[model samples]
Target: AEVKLYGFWPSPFSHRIIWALKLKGVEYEYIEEDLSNKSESLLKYNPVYKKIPVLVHGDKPIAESLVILEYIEETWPENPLLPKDPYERAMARFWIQYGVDTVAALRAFYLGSGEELEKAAKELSECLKILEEQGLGDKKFFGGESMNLVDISYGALGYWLAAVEEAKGVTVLKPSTLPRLHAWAKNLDELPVVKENIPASDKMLAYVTAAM
Candidate 1:
């Protein structure tokens, strides 16, 4: 069966799928989408949200980055993303959901002003603090030694966050504050798969700047 990925280059969501597929050594065809004028295939494949990062396996179309990630994991069970133990797998899933739930806080922090910005930043910091202290602790990666679904889910914090930080001239993932997560981001950035899949920093920074 042929695998096709409909993605936008600057999307961290799309990069998640790319990194996952590459880690599993899956051969895939990449179709870059012009988000402003989305392709008919992307629209048809993901009619509900009509978004990029849709995974097409054979004739089956899967939308949403997280959903597509789970599909990829189940389909290619060789380089397992989730943990083997039931308890460990549950913990991984919990953190994945935590990452998903933090997006709004991140958005607020990115797009707020003055007092609102400080409030949003504090809120986001609290969320990250829990992730650093409770979830990550002293682990090199969210998956401990290697990248996994949990790490993949938070892929944005690696490069995209840096772009956002540069564009906004604000440091959200500060080394002084979230040291563990700050180090985790560096570890993620160094991975061959991540380095190869992430968007160019200058390009991403420009895009984020323009968008802001």
Candidate 2:
């Protein structure tokens, strides 16, 4: 399988697929995209968004991280990313939508003004609370014991959020506030593939801070 990924470092969107591929033990060539100059391959492949993190499997190019994730799941069924149960899979999908829908809150947290940042922090906290209460609860992972797509989706956001917070010298994910979620973040970050693949916090902080 000739797998190629057109992506940029310090991009959670790109890291999402990276983590998925690593978890599935798939081999892929990663092409670093220069967002400022842009790449011919990236532009040619993902014409709609003209974005990085496009996954090219063999001759077919797949745009969008979520779609690529699903493709990977279908293509490599070993060590399944999604659950076997229909309702469980639906729940996972629901959480994925929830994470995507609340992504704006994260954006605000990353790059917003005084009131804007505060509002984003509050809204982001509210969203995390729902995830902790309704979504996660007592489970160690979203799929209980093992990680699934739900973990992958939110984990990407949480990882970047931590880096952003560290860079800005602020704290959105206080241990006193969202205990389970805070713990979840630490646990998710501990996963070998995720830990190994992500950029160092100092480098990520510098890159994201400059990019934003």
Candidate 3:
């Protein structure tokens, strides 16, 4: 299969898919998009939600980072991005789904201010608390041992979370309030492929701070 990845460098969604491909040792051509002006192919391929991370396998295109991850696992099962057991895989998928829904609401901090920002921040912290206590607990990764779907889903916490915190001049993900989530982010960053691909803290912080 001729693999190609359309991605944005700072996007956690894109980063997660990149990590999976790197872990699987899959050879793929990466096309970085200008987020302000999405390309023709991106729009045409993913008309519903035109976005980065349109994985092209030969002549077929797969949209959505989660969908792309599943495609990567199924197409190149060598490294197995997901668990073999159906039940375990379902649990993993469930947690990943939770992150998507919750963190999505948390993203209002990106383009909001004043009361909007405050509400988003509270929600983000509340969601993080739940994730730390319920989803992650004391586990090193969202899944024990190797990185898995939940880890990938929460990839934003390791990269964009720091940038957003610095930009907002506030901290939420902490070992004090959300200890499990704080530790989980660190562990995710410590992973081999994931560690290498994440954005530089200072650079990302500067960019996000400027954007805010």
Candidate 4:
């Protein structure tokens, strides 16, 4: 009867599991962790990474947001995040992979400076362009009609990116540059689950701005 999540507030990785579990209508206990001071349970569950957002179900602990999300998909199996069709599932995974590898633009914007910042911004713009032209296409979400693992994987863009853009005073995603992708961001933000599960933009802005 124990489904406990060890997560940090304002963390996009943590929110991934929160959104996934909430979407599946799973009842779980949420333990907010102060990242600077790690908890024994978090360290015990995820000794290797020792990271926040560790999911413990029946004392069986799972670390990593992507891994936890997949576990939730399999365990719940109600509102399917992964597609059933083999080829379609493969396609979903393809975009998910693209997003996982490419969507580090927010981090780049936060961590980089001077010419490094310019380069990161340029790379981020290119990444968004590819997702717009190839990954997303004309679909409402990466899963086409419904929200899928791919959408959850990129959901950070909807919330965290907004904060990062505000904190860094840069616009990596905009209607002028990425029209379709811009709309995609709006759609994700407007989703009930996404809206409810995300961190406050003001808090995130201050956290990142102060940290940087």
User: Which candidate ranks first by lDDT, i.e. highest?
Assistant: 1
Estimate, for each residue in 117-154, the C-alpha lDDT of model 3 and write its tens digit: 88888788888888778788777777677777677778
User: RMSD of candidate 1 to the true fold?
Assistant: 1.2
Question: Which digits, one per residue and each the tens of the lDDT, describe model 2 over residues 1-212?
Answer: 48999998888889989989988989999999989989888888999999978999986899988899999999999999898899989999998899875687788787865787778788888888898899999999987898888888887656688877776667888779999988988898998878988898888878878877
Which candidate leads in TM-score? 1
Per-candidate Cα lDDT values, in order, are 0.89, 0.85, 0.81, 0.86
In candidate 2 the C-alpha lDDT for residue 121 amounts to 80
- Candidate 4 structure quality by residue, lDDT tens digits, 8-103: 888888988988998899889999998789988888999999897899999999998888988999999999999899999898878877865575
TM-scores for every candidate against the unseen true structure: 0.96, 0.95, 0.91, 0.95
Misplaced by over 4 Å in model 2 are none
Off by over 4 Å in 1: none
Residue lDDT tens for model 1, 137-180: 99988999988899998878879988887776678898899998
Candidate 3 clashing pairs, residues 3+ apart or interchain: none
Candidate 2, TM-score vs. the true structure? 0.95
RMSD of each: 1.2, 1.3, 1.8, 1.3
Which run of 10 residues does model 2 get worst, by summed lDDT?
Answer: 166-175
Decreasing lDDT order of the candidates = 1, 4, 2, 3
